[PDB]
Every structure is written in structure tokens, then in C-alpha cells.
Scaffold this active site. Structure first.
Site, PDB file in Angstrom:
ATOM      1  N   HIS A  41      19.734  20.246   9.677  1.00  0.00           N
ATOM      2  CA  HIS A  41      18.693  21.090  10.261  1.00  0.00           C
ATOM      3  C   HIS A  41      17.658  20.295  11.032  1.00  0.00           C
ATOM      4  O   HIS A  41      16.688  20.883  11.496  1.00  0.00           O
ATOM      5  CB  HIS A  41      18.025  21.991   9.198  1.00  0.00           C
ATOM      6  CG  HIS A  41      17.140  21.281   8.210  1.00  0.00           C
ATOM      7  ND1 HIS A  41      15.904  20.765   8.541  1.00  0.00           N
ATOM      8  CD2 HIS A  41      17.287  21.072   6.877  1.00  0.00           C
ATOM      9  CE1 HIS A  41      15.343  20.238   7.462  1.00  0.00           C
ATOM     10  NE2 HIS A  41      16.161  20.411   6.438  1.00  0.00           N
ATOM     11  N   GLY A 143       8.277  16.980   5.580  1.00  0.00           N
ATOM     12  CA  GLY A 143       8.684  15.675   6.041  1.00  0.00           C
ATOM     13  C   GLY A 143       9.547  14.899   5.072  1.00  0.00           C
ATOM     14  O   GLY A 143       9.985  13.786   5.406  1.00  0.00           O
ATOM     15  N   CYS A 145      12.499  15.826   3.790  1.00  0.00           N
ATOM     16  CA  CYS A 145      13.930  16.086   3.909  1.00  0.00           C
ATOM     17  C   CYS A 145      14.657  14.817   4.327  1.00  0.00           C
ATOM     18  O   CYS A 145      14.144  14.021   5.118  1.00  0.00           O
ATOM     19  CB  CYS A 145      14.194  17.199   4.923  1.00  0.00           C
ATOM     20  SG  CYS A 145      13.289  18.724   4.614  1.00  0.00           S
TER      21      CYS A 145
HETATM   22  O1  LIG Z   1       9.978  18.656  11.392  1.00  0.00           O
HETATM   23  C1  LIG Z   1      10.293  19.197  10.149  1.00  0.00           C
HETATM   24  N1  LIG Z   1      10.535  20.571  10.076  1.00  0.00           N
HETATM   25  C2  LIG Z   1      10.848  21.137   8.852  1.00  0.00           C
HETATM   26  C3  LIG Z   1      10.931  20.348   7.690  1.00  0.00           C
HETATM   27  C4  LIG Z   1      11.271  21.110   6.408  1.00  0.00           C
HETATM   28  C5  LIG Z   1      12.162  22.188   6.457  1.00  0.00           C
HETATM   29  C6  LIG Z   1      12.486  22.942   5.322  1.00  0.00           C
HETATM   30  C7  LIG Z   1      13.478  24.095   5.385  1.00  0.00           C
HETATM   31  C8  LIG Z   1      14.715  23.881   5.999  1.00  0.00           C
HETATM   32  C9  LIG Z   1      15.652  24.926   6.053  1.00  0.00           C
HETATM   33 CL1  LIG Z   1      17.228  24.685   6.865  1.00  0.00          CL
HETATM   34  C10 LIG Z   1      15.352  26.179   5.491  1.00  0.00           C
HETATM   35  C11 LIG Z   1      14.125  26.389   4.851  1.00  0.00           C
HETATM   36  O2  LIG Z   1      13.859  27.646   4.272  1.00  0.00           O
HETATM   37  C12 LIG Z   1      12.997  27.739   3.162  1.00  0.00           C
HETATM   38  C13 LIG Z   1      13.040  29.193   2.685  1.00  0.00           C
HETATM   39  C14 LIG Z   1      12.077  30.126   3.081  1.00  0.00           C
HETATM   40  C15 LIG Z   1      12.174  31.455   2.628  1.00  0.00           C
HETATM   41  C16 LIG Z   1      13.226  31.858   1.788  1.00  0.00           C
HETATM   42  C17 LIG Z   1      14.196  30.925   1.399  1.00  0.00           C
HETATM   43  C18 LIG Z   1      14.093  29.603   1.858  1.00  0.00           C
HETATM   44 CL2  LIG Z   1      15.297  28.374   1.385  1.00  0.00          CL
HETATM   45  C19 LIG Z   1      13.187  25.342   4.801  1.00  0.00           C
HETATM   46  C20 LIG Z   1      11.871  22.567   4.109  1.00  0.00           C
HETATM   47  O3  LIG Z   1      12.144  23.264   2.936  1.00  0.00           O
HETATM   48  N2  LIG Z   1      10.973  21.499   4.061  1.00  0.00           N
HETATM   49  C21 LIG Z   1      10.341  21.112   2.824  1.00  0.00           C
HETATM   50  C22 LIG Z   1       8.993  21.422   2.628  1.00  0.00           C
HETATM   51  C23 LIG Z   1       8.406  21.031   1.423  1.00  0.00           C
HETATM   52  C24 LIG Z   1       9.151  20.335   0.462  1.00  0.00           C
HETATM   53  N3  LIG Z   1      10.496  20.011   0.679  1.00  0.00           N
HETATM   54  C25 LIG Z   1      11.096  20.413   1.875  1.00  0.00           C
HETATM   55  C26 LIG Z   1      10.660  20.778   5.209  1.00  0.00           C
HETATM   56  C27 LIG Z   1      10.681  18.954   7.760  1.00  0.00           C
HETATM   57  O4  LIG Z   1      10.738  18.126   6.630  1.00  0.00           O
HETATM   58  N4  LIG Z   1      10.357  18.387   9.000  1.00  0.00           N
END
Ligand SMILES: O=c1[nH]cc(-c2cc(-c3cc(Cl)cc(OCc4ccccc4Cl)c3)c(=O)n(-c3cccnc3)c2)c(=O)[nH]1
Lengths: 301, 305
Positions: A41, A143, A145
Site C-alpha cells: 500500500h 509511518g 508500516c
Molecule cells: O504515508 C503513509 N500513509 C499511510 C500510512 C498508514 C496506513 C495505514 C492503513 C493502510 C491500509 Cl492498506 C488500510 C488502512 O485501513 C485502516 C482501517 C480503517 C477503517 C476500517 C478498517 C481499517 Cl483496517 C490503514 C495504517 O493503518 N497506518 C498505521 C497507523 C497507525 C499505526 N499503525 C499503522 C499507517 C503510513 O504509515 N504512511
């Protein structure tokens, strides 16, 4: 003496962490030999998240759309390919710091260490367990991921987890290093409920043997139980079923302490019935389920 | 989101651990530039250990009574000296992995990471705090002596602890890297016991803030207290006194969250009188005191060294 939740020394993984940027999206990658692995992603925009079509987004990309930075050095991407939910970026220089490694897919109940990273730079290291509902209860901000989970055995790093997402409940979902998700989750922002989080029973028993081993027996009793009677009781407390395989796996700890597994199961049944009554066990006021039979032998002997 | 007990990444320290042998006693050493640092009690036998005369014991020793190994490489000791309870072995090779570093002395209530080693081989890393009774509640087995504790600021390793011994209660005692003991302990096989430990009040308050940051909010009430009032409760429950300095340290968290310190102290006051009894905060049934205010900010903001 003493019992801490210990993580593996993080150095071999630190030497592999890089920063991967695509458009406005920046996350971490794992640089091994001449390949950088990161979550696919990274090629998504916020407008893509609801129903991303990864194959369509990837075909539109050229090598130089991917900015990979190891520390100060920019790595040149010479090829890319997708395997399940992990993107594999081919680069033109192999990581000199590549350790002896392997990719392993773990089962629920297994523990590992997480090197939380941001912008390709490690922030901290903690010990984790794969919950029975295939999530992990991590500590992760935006950030993070591409941060990976791992065990080390002698000098071999076995990578077992890469972080992809935080679910709405605050727990975390991710893949093995072949890009296959743990659990029923998808790398897309759509509703997806994790199963009920249960307690890892075999791990709790291992930690009670660890507590005996360190000279604490206040919780034992005179009773015993059948396997089925134990499971009938324990599942009423949202404990995972204990299996004969679990029973065999605890055998070494049973012999070392002279306490039969089914006898320790009786103690657990009573612990669930009574609680702690103001006491602690290895410094916890709760029953601890993120140490495995293998971890206990590791830290104790 | 989430909150875990987090150690610094240990890579920079891993490259400094070596194995030191003097006779039949073998433990760990810290190799920085061309000096290996380790506990001075490595020169003792079990009979020496009962009441050692270290200056005399060391006079008897010679450079070749020290066998130091970095992995499979042999390091030639070419000079030795004592600084307090720490032995300093001059070797012929500078550690090419020597990181930017300094020796610091921490205070009780501050936290640090421990890289537990055995035969100069790192095996695990974990986060812990210097208790108010100057012990640490670590996890050490035989052969762990010489393992070090540290903090990292940007790129600079701040070495603060070297492990010397296990007290009969299972807790642990050590020195800074200049060989000064933390706590009223001596490096001698003799009857020693730590004083009554207390609870690091400022750290509990910071962890409660971490809980609020992570959505755990049930313990907030509408009251405020005063330091005098709270400290009487603290003093009663074997809690460290809360100083004005502690309040200022928690200032940022009081902003980011909207709960004032004495506001939160009222919450902790109420938690102390009543209790929890198997009900939880951030996945714990007890009040955690091994996260400093800075640990909570750093973890809840993503600082990366
Ligand atoms: O530039 C960047 N952009 C994005 C990210 C990023 C992106 C996501 C992410 C990715 C996908 Cl594919 C689906 C998704 O959906 C969530 C959801 C919502 C509603 C219902 C179900 C689900 Cl699952 C979320 C994420 O979770 N995190 C994060 C945040 C905090 C802790 N750990 C990870 C970071 C990044 O790190 N850097």
C-alpha cells in the site's frame, strides 16, 4: 533471577531498515541482499484506500517512482514485483549488513520482537505475541508500516511479521514476509472485525511453571483435572482450548518442576475462579500469556 | 496507537560486548576504543570473594591473567587498572564499532535499557528503571555480570549501568561505568539487603497520561487536590513524594491531554484509597511506574534516534 519480557538484540535488524517513498506516502522497508521488501500500500493514495486495485496501480509505476533511502544513501531501484501484499523492490547494491536470515510464518501464540521504525530509522524494540485472533497488540504510530517482527536463533534472524495496518480497535494487522496476511484481513480501508481475542492458555501455563521455577508456589493446590474438564471451564473465561500437543509441549517444564501439566491446569482453574486476592505472580497482578514454553526455558535456564 | 515497555535499539551496544576471563570466573566486558570495562570482582576466587583486598588481588594479577575475546578474535591485554569497582583492561586493538558515547550517572526513577549478555554474547534487551532503593528489577542469570544499561540520544549512547550482582531477594545491584555503586552495596560475598522500595510517583502519573492518550479514561474525576494533601496519601502508600519539579516535567502531558497534574493526582489519590482488584489500565492490573514522562512522550510521538 527475575522475569522480564525480553526482546531479542535488535542490531541485525537495524542494519536492514530503509525508508521507501512513493508520491506523498513514506513507510519503512526491509533491505536484504539486493531486495527491499515493504507493504504494497505504499503505492496507494488516500483516494485509493477504499478499494485499491494494486495491479492497476503498480503497472503505472516505473522504477524511478520509488525513492528508497538507506540512511543518507539513495538506493537505485532497478526492478519491482508484487508478491501477495508485499512489494519487492530490486535495487542495484546488496545490503552489506544483510544477516543470515529466513522468512518463517508463525502460528497464534508464538512470540517475537518488533523493531518499531519511522522513516527507516528505529525508534524502539519490544516483545510481542501473535494473538489467537491473528492480530498483535503493538505500539505503532503513522509511518510505522513496514516495521518487522523477528526472532533470532544463534545468528539467524527469522523474519515472521511486517506491519501494515492499525484496525479501528487499536490492534495491529500484517503479513509474513511472503506478503500473506495473518488472519482474515485485507490491505484496504474496509470494515473487517478481528475475532474474539482469547487468552493463550498454553502460554499462561508456561509462565506459571516459570513462577514455580523462580520459587513461588502460593497458587498451587491438591486438585487435578481431565483435559476436557479443564477446557470446559477455561473456555468460559475466553481461554483458548488446550490441546494434547500443548500438553506434550509443556512436558519438559513439567519434569523440571515435578508438577504434572494437568495438575498445573487445576491451579489455573482455581486462579481463574479466585483471582489473585491481592498477590502477584512474577510481578504481575494478571495471568500473563505472552511467554511461550520455549521462552520460559530460554530466560530461566 | 498502543503502549508497550520499549527498549532502545541495542545495535550500537551489541558491537561493544566481549568476553573476559580471569581464572575460572568468566563474565562480560564493554569494549570502547582500546579499553575493556568490566566488574573488578572478576579477579576474585570464591575465597577471595568473602572479604577481598582488590588492590592486593590486582597487584598479584598480570596482563596475561586476563583472557578477553571479541567473538572468535583474541584481544591482547597490554595494561590494566582499577577505577572504583570497575576494572579497565587496555587492549592492543581499538574497537572499530565504537559508537559515539558517554558515561553518565542516572538518578532513581530514571529508566534505561539493559542488554543482557552471556560469554560476551548478547541474548536479550529489556527496559527497566532505577528503583528508589537503587536496585533494578532485572532478569539476570549467572554469567550476566558486566552487562550494561544505556540510553540513546540521537546517535549518542549514554552508558549508565554495569551489572555486578544479584541480591538475595532476586533484585540486582550495579555501578555506573566509573565503578561507583548505585545504592548502599559493596562488591563482596556478604549479607546485604536493599531498603524498602517505594513507587515512582511521577512515573505512575505519566503512565496514566499515556492511558488517557490511548483512550483509557475511566479514572478521571472532576476534582483537584494539592501537593500537601496528595503527598500525605503518597507517604501513606509507600509512594515517593511529588515535587514541584515533577509537575513541570508533566506539563506537556497536561497540555496535550487537558488533565492538570493535581487533577491527575486526585485520580491517582482516588486509585490509591479504593483500588482496582483485577480491573485494568493499559492492560495492567497494577499502577506501572517504569515509564518516565519522557518515555511516554517519545513513545507517543515516534522519536527515532
Ligand atoms: O504515508 C503513509 N500513509 C499511510 C500510512 C498508514 C496506513 C495505514 C492503513 C493502510 C491500509 Cl492498506 C488500510 C488502512 O485501513 C485502516 C482501517 C480503517 C477503517 C476500517 C478498517 C481499517 Cl483496517 C490503514 C495504517 O493503518 N497506518 C498505521 C497507523 C497507525 C499505526 N499503525 C499503522 C499507517 C503510513 O504509515 N504512511
Amino acid at each position: 533471577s527475575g522475569f522480564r519480557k525480553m526482546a531479542f538484540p535488535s542490531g541485525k535488524v537495524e542494519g536492514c531498515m530503509v525508508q521507501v517513498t512513493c508520491g506523498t506516502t513514506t513507510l519503512n522497508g526491509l533491505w536484504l541482499d539486493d531486495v527491499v521488501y515493504c507493504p504494497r500500500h505504499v503505492i496507494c493514495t488516500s483516494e485509493d484506500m477504499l478499494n485499491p486495485n494494486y495491479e492497476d496501480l503498480l503497472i503505472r509505476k516505473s522504477n524511478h517512482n520509488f525513492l528508497v533511502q538507506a540512511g543518507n544513501v539513495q538506493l537505485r531501484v532497478i526492478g519491482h514485483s508484487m508478491q501477495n501484499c508485499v512489494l519487492k523492490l530490486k535495487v542495484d547494491t546488496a545490503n552489506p549488513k544483510t544477516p543470515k536470515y529466513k522468512f518463517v510464518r508463525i502460528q497464534p501464540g508464538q512470540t517475537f520482537s518488533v523493531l518499531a521504525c519511522y522513516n527507516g530509522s528505529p525508534s524502539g524494540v519490544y516483545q510481542c505475541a501473535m494473538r489467537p485472533n491473528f492480530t498483535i497488540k503493538g505500539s505503532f504510530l503513522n509511518g510505522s508500516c513496514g516495521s518487522v517482527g523477528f526472532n533470532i536463533d544463534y545468528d539467524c534472524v527469522s523474519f515472521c511479521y511486517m506491519h501494515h495496518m492499525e484496525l479501528p480497535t487499536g490492534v495491529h494487522a500484517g503479513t509474513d514476509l511472503e506478503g500473506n496476511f495473518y488472519g482474515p484481513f485485507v490491505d484496504r480501508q474496509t470494515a473487517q472485525a478481528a475475532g474474539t481475542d482469547t487468552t493463550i492458555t498454553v502460554n499462561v501455563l508456561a509462565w506459571l511453571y516459570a513462577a514455580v521455577i523462580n520459587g513461588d508456589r502460593w497458587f498451587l493446590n491438591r486438585f487435578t483435572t481431565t483435559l476436557n474438564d479443564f477446557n470446559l471451564v477455561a473456555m468460559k473465561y475466553n481461554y483458548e482450548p488446550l490441546t494434547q500437543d500443548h500438553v506434550d509441549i509443556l512436558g519438559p517444564l513439567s519434569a523440571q518442576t515435578g508438577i504434572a501439566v494437568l495438575d498445573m491446569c487445576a491451579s489455573l482453574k482455581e486462579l481463574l475462579q479466585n483471582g489473585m486476592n491481592g498477590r502477584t505472580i512474577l510481578g504481575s497482578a494478571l495471568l500473563e500469556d505472552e511467554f511461550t514454553p520455549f521462552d520460559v526455558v530460554r530466560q530461566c535456564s
